[model samples]
Target: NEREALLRAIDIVRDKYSEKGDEETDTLLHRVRLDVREGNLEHAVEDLKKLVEKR
Candidate 1:
């Protein structure tokens, strides 16, 4: 269920970025989507952390 939890975290972060603004969210989504495409969860998590930090 850890994957599910992480996905949920991703979803929450995505939504939050959406509500917050596009400039930040676009880059975050770019990083997140890139990681997702690459199947690199660890880096995605790092980018997600950055995503929040950028906010």
Candidate 2:
């Protein structure tokens, strides 16, 4: 499904940079992970779209 792909996309990005984040960054990431994992792609797409638009 599209939601799965979207979550997977966000997860890939999170896993990629997780090692670089500090404590607060980690907290922010934790929340983001939860959001995407819980089928919140609609919100995730907001940020993801920003990245796409930036390129």
Candidate 3:
């Protein structure tokens, strides 16, 4: 599904960077992981869109 792809996209970026983010950023990543794992990609995408856009 598109949601899985989106989560994977988020993950790919995280992996590439080794994801040493600050508190806000780390929290976002943590939530995204939970969102994706919990089938909340609609929610995840809202934040992750910014993640991709900012990069």
Candidate 4:
């Protein structure tokens, strides 16, 4: 379930940000992974919003 949630978060980030899957994207995804692994799914999504805001 966590993996599914993580995948969903990844897709949400990709679609919402349209990231180019570049180094920055990879780095962000890694952070998402860590966040998800640590049971921080909601925070992970919120952190992703920061990426959009920074842009």
Best by TM-score: 4
Question: All models: lDDT?
Answer: 0.69, 0.63, 0.73, 0.73
TM-score of each: 0.49, 0.45, 0.51, 0.53
Per-residue error for 9 in candidate 2, Å, reads: 0.7
Clashes of each: 0, 0, 0, 0
lDDT of 3 at 53: 80
lDDT of 2 by residue, 1-55 (tens): 7667865765676666668764544455566657777877568557455545765
Residue-wise C-alpha lDDT for candidate 3, range 1-55, written one tens digit per residue? 8667867876776565555645556667778888888887699779778966876
Flag regions of model 4 displaced more than 4 Å.
5-21, 53-55
Clashing pairs in 3: none
| Model 4 lDDT per residue over 1-55, tens place | 8587767867676555445546766678767867877788798889778877887
lDDT of 1 by residue, 1-55 (tens): 6656656666776777676676757666766766766579788778778646766
TM-score ranking, high to low: 4, 3, 1, 2
Give the C-alpha lDDT of model 2: 0.63
Clash tally for model 4: 0
- Candidate 2 Cα outliers beyond 4 Å, as residue runs: 24-26, 36-55
